[PDB]
C-alpha cells in the first residue's frame, strides 16, 4: 500500500472533509460552503 500522504495528527474530522471534496467534484462540503457565502 502506498503512503504518499495520509500522514498527519488529527485525521478524525478533517478527513471526512477532504474525502468529501475527493468524491465531490466542485460543490459544497461543510464549513467551506459557509465561508464561500459571505466575503469570499
6 is in an annotated binding site: yes
Residue 20 CA: distances (Å) to CA of 7, 33, 39: 18, 12, 23
- Method used to determine the 3D structure: NMR
7, three cell numbers:
500522514
Q: Which residues contact 31 (CB under 8 A, 6 or more apart)?
A: 17
Per-position DSSP letters for 1-40, written without gaps between them: ---SS--SS--SSHHHHHHHHHHHSSS--SSHHHHTTTT-
Nearest to 29, CA basis, from 15, 9, 12 = 15
Domain residue limits, the chain: 1-40
- 3 labelled as ligand-binding? no
Q: Is 8 within any annotated ligand binding site?
A: no
End-to-end CA distance of the chain: 38
Query: Is the distance from CB of 16 to CB of 29 less than 8 angstroms?
Result: no
The CATH number of domain 1-40, selected from 2.40.160.20, 4.10.230.10, 3.40.190.150, 1.10.260.40 = 4.10.230.10
10 is in an annotated binding site: yes
Amino acid at each position: 500500500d502506498a503512503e504518499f500522504r495520509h500522514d498527519s495528527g488529527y485525521e478524525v474530522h478533517h478527513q471526512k472533509l477532504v474525502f468529501f471534496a475527493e468524491d465531490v467534484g466542485s460543490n459544497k462540503g461543510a464549513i467551506i460552503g459557509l465561508m464561500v457565502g459571505g466575503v469570499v
